[PDB]
Amino acid sequence: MSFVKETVDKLLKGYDIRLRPDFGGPPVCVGMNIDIASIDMVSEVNMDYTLTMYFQQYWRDKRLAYSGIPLNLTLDNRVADQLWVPDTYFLNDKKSFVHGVTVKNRMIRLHPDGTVLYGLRITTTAACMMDLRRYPLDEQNCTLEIESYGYTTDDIEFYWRGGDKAVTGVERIELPQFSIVEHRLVSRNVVFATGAYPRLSLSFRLKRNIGYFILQTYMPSILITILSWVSFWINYDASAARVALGITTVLTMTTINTHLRETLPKIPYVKAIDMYLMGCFVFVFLALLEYAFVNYIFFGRDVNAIDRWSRIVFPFTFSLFNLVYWLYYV
Amino acid sequence: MRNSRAIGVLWAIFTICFAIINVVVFIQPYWVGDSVSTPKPGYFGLFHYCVGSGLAGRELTCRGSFTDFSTIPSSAFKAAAFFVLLSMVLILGCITCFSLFFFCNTATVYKICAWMQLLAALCLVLGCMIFPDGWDAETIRDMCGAKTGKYSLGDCSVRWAYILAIIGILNALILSFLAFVLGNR
């Protein structure tokens, strides 16, 4: 017992937090690992995503070397106050914190060879832009960029420990609207005139799931558009019936539009769903305008020619519009 | 007329039983079960599947639903379940069309369910064909053995739902032909 105590006591003294390991020597190589516990929420409105993870660094320090103690030492987390750590930080962060209950969720581990493993439980609201031009038929390219604030590559280097096995726990994630397709690791150096700074990047590709929209946005619009075409088979003298059907279909599309935007993200950005709804709106508008023409020409001024041609053109043109839309956006 | 009435009623009973069987096999996940050579315990159906957690009891953790295509771990399963659901819709359409016996002549309604039962059998047959093709998925490969693949049973067993699907196919074909002959009589 006492031998361990005096070992750690001599380890702590003579150690300067203000100086990095091998200050006059080569840069210290820091391996980095991540274990994602839960991506809590991904926001299109704010263009960000909250991510809870076990971040781990790993670096060799000669000053913290001890011998005669084959057992690994998991010191108290408060000991991390007295030990030097990298200046790692996330560039695309908007807000982040470390969980404090019951004790500060942090860990420092020493090894007999003098290596340090420094782990933290970080909940960070990272930022990623989202090309919503094809929403909801869109795939996002969200990233976590990890870099050193002050040191250049000459003073500190970052690499992924374990290679492609650096990041785990992605399979444990089940987002409520997105489906993770792939994750990629990139280790590089950003070069400026003064010097090159190390950087790591953890990039997830997220595919959006559309079955919600397919069943409550697209299918209602298609069926209201077809119910609008039902007008062309109603007898031309039935002005009340045909006008009521057309105007109520227009009102129903307006209702779908107005109440949809209440639920989708609050962004004045033009999206694919907006084009689809606008096209269906134009189609129902033209369906009512068709009866305007019909009532003026024949009643106002052996099915008539306008209904005869409408019955084929409107379904055919709507099918062509659907084909172009789905081919362009998919 | 007595004999025709009796056989018609019995045919209705059998069609209802076939519809119940179709619902049971569609919802239930016991199409493929684990085996002695299987690496882990579990069982997968058309869309739903239970996987061994990785401990003594395994908790029978399950995930997968036809309501969520994103959770079905293959494109062959999404087609097989779709065909089985189409069969469900057709047989239920016939069960509704029993109501048309009130007004329409008997022969026409009998023939209409004859074609609906034939189409239900065809869709169920197609679902049974494409269902094995999805056994090559990563989840199924991890479950029913590495050797398991497209139509390759491998280190894994087969459970009652898969054979009951073929039983329902046979029942559907028999009922379709029975209704066809009833219509002309």
Partner: protein
């Protein structure tokens, strides 16, 4: 003094375990008017350490069967840094202490049962012992019965009302069908506001979609009836085709489409409801 109760300040001097709750996105302890932490020592060599916590623990809710969904929400904890060889946890045994359920803040859910479990995880930095408590919760359907199911069913019935209206009342039946469609859309808009923005549809979404298809089918049925009534005008037995497609002549018997609809639509809806409720309540 056999029991030395301790102040809440110097507890930091005494080593305490690194117990942290794994499935917690945010937790805290209230600090006023004093810290809400206590410690006690017993000269036999025992330490007791009690806190006050309000954990917003996560719970992955599988809302596929919403509002018929039952959940088993977990609450897990383990040492943050010490593997199994360094710390091992355990229960007091003899169940877990819970107060009266009637005073709990469970409105949308009803408490059912409590369970405890322990296991060892295989994380990269050693193998930690994790202990979990599962709370079983069952949702109450009463709000969704009056908000969604009964209004949707009654709107479908009002769509069926069109079959008993005279066929020549074109504006009446057209307005009835299209306004039923509009009302169903209005209900469908609010059906999802309680739920999160989940991308797969639920049981209630499927119910609403089927009701929308039923009212759409009723309006299409009237349109079909209106167009045709006014605007238009070998081996066994015999042939193999005779055994199959009657297709005789072909419709002559289409003016009586309303009589067919009057039975078909209620019967189809009843069958859909039977299968849906049996599947989601008992057989699922």
């Amino acid at each position: 003094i056999k029991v030395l109760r301790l102040n809440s300040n110097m507890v930091g001097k005494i080593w305490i375990p690194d117990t942290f709750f794994r499935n917690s996105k945010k937790a805290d302890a209230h600090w006023i008017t004093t810290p809400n932490r206590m410690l006690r020592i017993w000269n036999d060599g025992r330490v007791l350490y009690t806190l006050r916590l309000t954990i917003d623990a996560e719970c992955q809710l599988q809302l596929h069967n919403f509002p018929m969904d039952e959940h088993s929400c977990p609450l897990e904890f383990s040492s943050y840094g010490y593997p199994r060889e360094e710390i091992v946890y355990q229960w007091k045994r003899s169940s877990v202490e819970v107060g009266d359920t009637r005073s709990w803040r469970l409105y949308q859910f009803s408490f059912v049962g409590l369970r405890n479990t322990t296991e060892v995880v295989k994380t990269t930095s050693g193998d930690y012992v994790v202990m979990s408590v599962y709370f079983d919760l069952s949702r109450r359907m009463g709000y969704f019965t009056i908000q969604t199911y009964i209004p949707c069913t009654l709107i479908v019935v009002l769509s069926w009302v069109s079959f008993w209206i005279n066929k020549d009342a074109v504006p009446a039946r057209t307005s009835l069908g299209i306004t039923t469609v509009l009302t169903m859309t209005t209900l469908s808009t609010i059906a999802r506001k309680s739920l999160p923005k989940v991308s797969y549809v639920t049981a209630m979404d499927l119910f609403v979609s089927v009701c929308f298809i039923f009212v759409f089918s009723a309006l299409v049925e009237y349109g079909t009836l209106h167009y045709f009534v006014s605007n238009r005008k070998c081996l066994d037995g015999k042939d193999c085709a005779s055994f199959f497609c009657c297709f005789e002549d072909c419709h002559i018997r289409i003016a009586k489409m309303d009589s067919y609809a009057r039975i078909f639509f209620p019967t189809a809806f009843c069958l859909f409801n039977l299968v849906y409720w049996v599947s989601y309540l008992y057989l699922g």
